[PDB]
Amino acid sequence: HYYVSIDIGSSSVKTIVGEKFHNGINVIGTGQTYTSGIKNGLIDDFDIARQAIKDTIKKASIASGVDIKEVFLKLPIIGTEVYDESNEIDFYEDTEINGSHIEKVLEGIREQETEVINVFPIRFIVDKENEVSDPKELIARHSLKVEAGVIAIQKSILINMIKCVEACGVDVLDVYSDAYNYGSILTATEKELGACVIDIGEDVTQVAFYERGELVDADSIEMAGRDITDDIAQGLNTSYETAEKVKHQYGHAFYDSASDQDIFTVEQVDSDETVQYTQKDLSDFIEARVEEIFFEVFDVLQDLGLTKVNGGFIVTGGSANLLGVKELLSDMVSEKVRIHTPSQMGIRKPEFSSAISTISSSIAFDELLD
């Protein structure tokens, strides 16, 4: 059937309706609603947040022609913990391992302040000896063990995000931390060599590092697009709103590559007076803040104890639309750099990476467990 994801963002709630193909996802509809009901990745006003989510499901329904009733929810990398764990289940007869057995051994891991939301297999072990990655259709005489990666989140976040969404008359079939979702926007080589995803949104910037095909660790920083706007507003002595517009229209994150011929007029906040500015002027502010964010990212990587980023950097999210971000980052790092943008029609904006990869995740577990 169809897969419906919901990304409850600080700038906009995003919903994608997709269909699973052998080698991909066919997107058949989207919904997007900007709201002030979400701040810093979390619900700021329940009622307003409910309205936006409800409205977005509506938009997604009308656009896809589907009667959305069940959805997969992405969860931000806040109050999150990643760790290892293993579990084993016993058989009392020769058993050909299928999806149900895998679901059961992982389930046990998903057995106080937090709640396990994702449990993915690193490797499986049949009858205390044969170690394999895919144990399907093979025979076990005694057992099936799993060495899994585990993501858990603070109960308060989970409980409130689900309640808010289910208050719009829909069922949350499953939850997917963005820590696991990003695994899907990376190529096999990136996930192997050791790659870092950086999603710069509005209030939150998220970081997730994958290595040897698996998620190693992740975290989030409270510095992103809004902060870029704030500096612009302060610098050009103009309102937040106007600063937001010039950021989209003339924004550039690399001063040297920023243009001078590009000019625009901005009204002042303290006087009827108006002032002229060049893109290079605007870029002074944008580069400074984006640079800071990246330095914040490097600090996260060190605390996480992750020097060495062999697979390169993948930058995505709404602020990734900013010109000069690739230049800026590669100008301060030796490893490869790229901006990820979903390829499907209608969601070809970096802000859609979370929503679309949430579907990739639902599909992955669909194929794993079925």
Ligand SMILES: Nc1ncnc2c1ncn2[C@@H]1O[C@H](COP(=O)(O)OP(=O)(O)NP(=O)(O)O)[C@@H](O)[C@H]1O
């Ligand atoms: N063309 C653009 N140029 C520069 N910035 C942009 C552009 N388009 C969107 N943005 C910024 O992208 C941010 C929102 O992107 P988004 O990835 O959707 O964040 P979010 O997911 O809604 N909220 P969150 O992830 O919780 O921080 C806002 O700060 C926008 O100003």
Ligand SMILES: [Cl-]
């Ligand atoms: Cl075990």
Ligand SMILES: [Cl-]
């Ligand atoms: Cl994806």
Ligand SMILES: [Mg+2]
């Ligand atoms: Mg986001």
Ligand SMILES: [Mg+2]
């Ligand atoms: Mg907001």
